[PDB]
Design a protein around this nucleic acid. Structure first.
Ligand SMILES: [Zn+2]
Lengths: 213, 192, 82, 135, 175
RNA sequence: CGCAAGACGGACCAGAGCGAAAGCAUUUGCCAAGAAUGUUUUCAUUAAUCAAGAACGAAAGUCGGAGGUUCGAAGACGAUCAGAUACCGUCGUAGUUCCGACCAUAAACGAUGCCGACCGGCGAUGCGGCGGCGUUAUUCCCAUGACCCGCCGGGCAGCUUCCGGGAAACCAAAGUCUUUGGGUUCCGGGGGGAGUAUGGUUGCAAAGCUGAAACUUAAAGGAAUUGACGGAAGGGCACCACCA
């Protein structure tokens, strides 16, 4: 009986200021049906946006996640929520005759955003290596896992999100660990494979306004 | 560097596409042309120098040497100008300069109709082992005279004694030749 | 094959073998003679040393115990006792 | 009615192609995914449960939603292609691979092909026995 | 201009360099598409152009360069460009029955046969073409030709000898 | 998009490693063990194999508790066939999970006791050590890792071979055996009856360990070789086949 898309509306998603592109798509929202507010039904959605759909000089085997927190007259003013890699890239990296090394740390930001960072780094066959295998002994792996736990402990702790996200976008963190682990066992593809989001502060409007402009 | 589908045709003198022909010309200082109507200035190709007896041949097809007869030919890239400035990138990298997978014991020399000696020289008399012509041929699936009859692929040869002796293509399985003999093969393989 | 004088082996081979498996057992370690540069005192340390040989008047480590041979410290040379 | 957008600028959506062994789903959503735009099940078209997981039933579902997609201004799609995963098979079937090629020619601008299959790291007991099951 | 990209493993790299006229020519000519192999990401990546005629000239080009990555022969992969409905179904060899150790490696011996004779047979009688990776079984054919390619494949790798499989194909191949 | 409960630790995962054997794969910390390598440290025959006896012992099973996601013997349903209570699917108890006791069997396998000696090669790999031109850790100062070449020792494995064996298949041990003796433990005597009966013993039970005879029978069995026939499939030929 009822054609429901006459009862809809159309909002715009707009990225925060770390990225070149801001308006990156649409999002359907049913209007206020008296009781439930149309802004209320929008207030928590996540957006699995890639990298080259946000910053143009960049390779898009990475992703980001973004919360429509505020509804300000047909704009989704959008926060940072999380980060992970493309599963095709993940399945591409895990070869056989090398070693997978991981670590995970729970770090706070300076502004109350509790993060859980992950790390993935692989051993690297040398450019004169003849042995098919490139494995690190288990104590070498516990060394490398500690610096992986060390480097991304300080950098979220020292900073806030607007500086942390900017470290994520060229993966400034993972390029540090690559140089910092050459002396133990040379690594190959060291990334922050995934970043979770554990807790948030009380919500601040003007923090988000300054996070856009 | 894309392809941008025009560039396949963009990939007094002479018109030779053989580098053994093109090498001798520019060392005299003889500017020639090609199917490209412009003259030649750059000659980029590959030759094979014997790592054993230091003997370069312009042939890229052979894998055994012409002077010493070993498998010590290695890939050598050249760059020849119109004047004939021979400057050759000898790849100084010990992944190629390597004695690793080079010593292994060989089976007894076997003589018979179906013996397979492990291809040492370029001309020792192998027995005539050939594929059956109903197996050796692939599909010319381009050709539109194609609809009538059999399955959408080539029929596999399960009948002949070319298949029972497991005769394979000499080009097929070449990546297993590059594997060193003394390695960790899986416990249920058997090659040729 | 089949023709080897075991009375007279070649010494490089005899150096190459495991120390118990020679014709007659001759071990591989020796005595180095540690000359610490800071002091003047000649100290004699075993080549495959275990736990730390200190300097007497200087309280200075001359060697650290690794697996097979001991590692010296910086600048401390040695002279092999013939 | 809908996205009042200039013509060089696409209005992306997200299409969920769920494969099974009994049917295939085609499911066009928001970029968030919380609203879907239209869900046409692969066993809505063919009235034969034998043919419910057909490539042909996949074509008929995907043509009837790119009709509905183009109806509502969605000119482009990011495709989250999906198996059943978990304990059972991990790779999406040809009935998912069919509907992909179906709404490619139907005028939808196809962007990123995404493999969202539920994969376990380490799962519970397989539904089959120790002896095996036909698959 | 829209594009597709698709990865490569390291054992499938050297087949591309051996076949970079034969994968090269039909994509660029018969479909009007542009093809690269990004070595900094090691992916094969094609895009459309102005000379791209068909709307789905790209989609059936991706599956051709997918099937070559999945180990299929070059010529036998070419018909994905041409024929309207060829497909592929991929397997985990342990998705049917939990083999392991050498009981896993004897599933490969049954499903290959001596000299490939069992693989060569099921391709002939079920109008398909299959490729065995280690834990992975990839089949390529029509849908009903696929649906009775899995069952000859599934029933080799839960115990039955090839002769009971050879008999039980042709009772279904009659229809 | 959240919340919860329990199991699981894929890919990495290798003819790699460890453990007496069953067996063992998320990080971190703690608790004690262990081989191998290194030794110009110590004791100076302290040993090898082992009836009695003892610890551990896959899965399933039995009692208590706790926990009950997945899967699931039994059981209850619903379905194609001349026949089916079977090959199917839906649920699903016990169990699969943790803790405390029992229980002691497996195609527990290398279907191959343990210790020692001798007897052909060849590289690869795991761990430790030794030596060395080189390249990278931003070079460099020595470090120390990461690779690279070689050597030693003990490992898991290969590959090779007219060593010698073997009924042969095959084995570098299954060799050094009529030219028969290094030391030592368990254990077989044509095939069934039968691992049954009875007795003893352990256990709550299930069962485990030990274990016959009367009687019956001319074979049973092992390797290797040729066919036959296919309700097995394809290639070649034929107007006693087909197409036109
Ligand atoms: Zn030569």
């Amino acid at each position: 009986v009822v054609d429901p898309f006459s009862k809809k509306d159309w909002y715009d998603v707009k990225a925060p200021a770390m990225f070149n592109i801001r308006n990156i798509g649409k999002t359907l929202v049913t209007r206020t049906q008296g009781t439930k507010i149309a802004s209320d039904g929008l207030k928590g959605r996540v957006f699995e946006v890639s990298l080259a759909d946000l910053q143009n000089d960049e390779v898009a085997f990475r992703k980001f996640k973004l919360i429509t927190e505020d509804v300000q007259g047909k704009n989704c003013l959008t926060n940072f929520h999380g980060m992970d890699l493309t599963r095709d890239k993940m399945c591409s990296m895990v070869k056989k005759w090398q070693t997978m090394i991981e670590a995970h740390v729970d770090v706070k930001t300076t502004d109350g955003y509790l993060l859980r960072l992950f790390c993935v780094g692989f051993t690297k066959k040398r450019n004169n290596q003849i042995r098919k295998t490139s494995y690190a002994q288990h104590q070498q792996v516990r060394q490398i896992r500690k610096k992986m736990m060390e480097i991304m402990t300080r950098e979220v702790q020292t900073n806030d999100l607007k500086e942390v996200v900017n470290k994520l976008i060229p993966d400034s963190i993972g390029k540090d660990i690559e140089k910092a682990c050459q002396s133990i066992y040379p690594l190959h593809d060291v990334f922050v494979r995934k970043v979770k989001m554990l807790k948030k502060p009380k919500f601040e409007l003007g923090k988000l306004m300054e996070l856009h402009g | 560097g894309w392809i941008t589908p025009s560039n396949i045709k963009q990939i007094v003198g002479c018109l030779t596409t053989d580098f053994a022909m093109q090498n001798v010309l520019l060392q005299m200082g003889l500017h020639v042309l090609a199917v490209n109507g412009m003259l030649i200035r750059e000659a980029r190709s590959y030759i094979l120098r014997c790592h054993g007896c230091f003997k370069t041949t312009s042939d890229m097809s052979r894998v055994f040497c012409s002077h010493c007869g070993n498998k010590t030919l290695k890939k050598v890239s050249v760059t020849v100008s119109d004047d004939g400035t021979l400057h050759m990138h000898f790849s100084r990298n010990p992944k190629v300069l390597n004695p690793r997978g080079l010593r292994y014991s060989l089976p007894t020399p076997k003589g018979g109709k179906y013996a397979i000696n492990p291809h040492l020289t370029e001309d020792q008399r192998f027995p005539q082992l050939r594929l059956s012509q109903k197996a050796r041929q692939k599909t010319n699936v381009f050709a539109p005279d194609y609809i009538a009859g059999v399955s959408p692929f080539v029929e596999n040869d399960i009948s002949s004694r070319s298949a029972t002796l497991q005769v394979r293509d000499s080009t097929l399985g070449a990546g297993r030749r590059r594997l060193n003999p003394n390695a960790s093969r899986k416990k249920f393989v058997k090659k040729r | 094959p089949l023709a080897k004088d075991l009375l007279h082996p070649s010494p490089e081979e005899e150096k190459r073998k495991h120390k118990k498996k020679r014709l007659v057992q001759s071990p591989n370690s020796y005595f180095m003679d540690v000359k610490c540069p800071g002091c003047y005192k000649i100290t004699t340390v075993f080549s495959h040393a275990q736990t730390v040989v200190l300097c007497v008047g200087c309280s200075t480590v001359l060697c650290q115990p690794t697996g097979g041979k001991a590692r010296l410290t910086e600048g401390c040379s040695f002279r092999r006792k013939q | 009615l809908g996205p009042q957008v200039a013509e060089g600028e696409n209005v992306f959506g997200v299409c969920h192609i769920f494969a099974s062994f009994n049917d295939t789903f085609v499911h066009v959503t928001d970029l968030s995914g919380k609203e879907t735009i239209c869900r046409v099940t692969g066993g809505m078209k063919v009235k034969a449960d034998r043919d419910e997981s057909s490539p042909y039933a996949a074509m008929l579902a995907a043509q009837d939603v790119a009709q509905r997609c183009k109806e509502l201004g969605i000119t482009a799609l990011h495709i989250k292609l999906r198996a059943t995963g978990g304990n059972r098979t991990k790779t999406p079937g040809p009935g998912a691979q069919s509907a992909l090629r179906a709404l490619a020619r139907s005028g939808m601008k196809i962007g990123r092909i995404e493999d969202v299959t539920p994969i376990p790291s380490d799962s519970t007991r397989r539904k089959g026995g120790r002896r095996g099951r036909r698959l | 201009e829209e594009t597709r990209k698709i990865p490569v493993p390291a054992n499938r790299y050297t087949p591309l360099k051996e076949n970079w006229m034969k994968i090269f020519t039909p994509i660029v000519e018969h479909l009007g598409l542009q093809i690269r192999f990004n070595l900094k990401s090691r992916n094969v990546e094609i895009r459309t152009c102005k000379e791209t005629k068909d709307v789905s000239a790209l989609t059936k080009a991706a599956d051709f360069v997918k099937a070559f990555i999945l180990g299929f022969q070059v010529e036998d992969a070419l018909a994905l460009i041409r024929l309207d409905d060829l497909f592929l179904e991929s397997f985990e060899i342990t998705d049917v029955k939990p083999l392991k150790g050498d009981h896993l490696s004897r599933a490969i011996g049954r499903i290959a046969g001596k000299g490939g004779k069992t693989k060569f047979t099921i391709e002939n009688v079920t109008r398909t073409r299959i490729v065995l990776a280690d834990v992975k079984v990839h089949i390529l054919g029509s849908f009903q030709n696929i649906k009775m390619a899995r069952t000859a494949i599934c029933n080799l790798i839960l115990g039955n000898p090839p002769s009971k499989v050879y008999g039980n194909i042709r009772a279904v191949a009659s229809r």
